Ligand binder design. Structure first.
Ligand SMILES: [O-][Cl+3]([O-])([O-])[O-]
Ligand SMILES: [Cl-]
Ligand SMILES: [K+]
Length: 131
C-alpha cells in the first residue's frame, strides 16, 4: 500500500526525537517515511549518536531541524515525545493524526539514562508496528 509518514516532534531535535527517527527508520522503514523535529533546535547530542551506534544504528547523518510545514501537512501521524512538544505543536490539519508518547529528557544526565530512554523509545516503536 502507499507508504505513510510519521513525524517525531520533541522539545529539541537533539536526543529523544533523533533516537526515535533512528529506530523508526530501522523498524518502520518498509512502510514509513520517518522524520523528526523540535520546537527548538540545538544540535544533535553526541551521546544520542553514541547510544544508537551501540545498537548498530547510525544517526550521524541526521540534522537538527525545526518543524517543516510541508512535511507536517503531509504526515499521517505526528508523535510528540515531550509535554512541551505536545503543547507547542501547531494545530494539525484534519488529515494528520496526533499522539503523545512521553519520555524523560536525558540531556545532562549520566550515560545509562541515554541508554534507558533509547530502549524505551525502541519498545514504543516496536509496539506501534504491531497495530
Ligand atoms: O529530542 Cl529532544 O532533544 O527533546 O530530547
Ligand atoms: Cl512496517
Ligand atoms: K531531523
Amino acid at each position: 500500500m502507499d507508504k505513510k509518514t510519521i513525524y517525531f516532534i520533541s522539545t529539541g531535535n537533539s536526543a529523544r526525537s533523533q533516537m526515535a527517527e533512528g529506530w523508526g527508520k530501522e523498524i518502520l522503514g518498509e512502510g514509513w517515511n520517518v522524520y523528526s523535529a523540535g520546537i527548538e533546535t540545538h544540535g544533535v547530542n553526541p551521546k544520542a549518536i553514541e547510544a544508537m551506534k551501540e545498537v548498530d544504528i547510525d544517526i550521524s547523518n541526521h540534522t537538527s531541524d525545526l518543524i517543516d510545514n510541508d512535511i507536517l501537512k503531509q504526515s499521517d501521524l505526528v508523535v510528540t515525545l515531550s509535554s512541551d512538544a505536545d503543547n507547542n505543536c501547531p494545530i494539525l490539519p484534519p488529515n494528520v493524526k496526533k499522539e503523545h508518547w512521553g519520555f524523560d529528557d536525558p540531556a545532562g544526565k549520566e550515560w545509562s539514562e541515554f541508554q534507558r530512554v533509547r530502549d524505551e523509545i525502541k519498545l514504543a516503536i516496536e509496539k506501534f508496528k504491531l497495530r
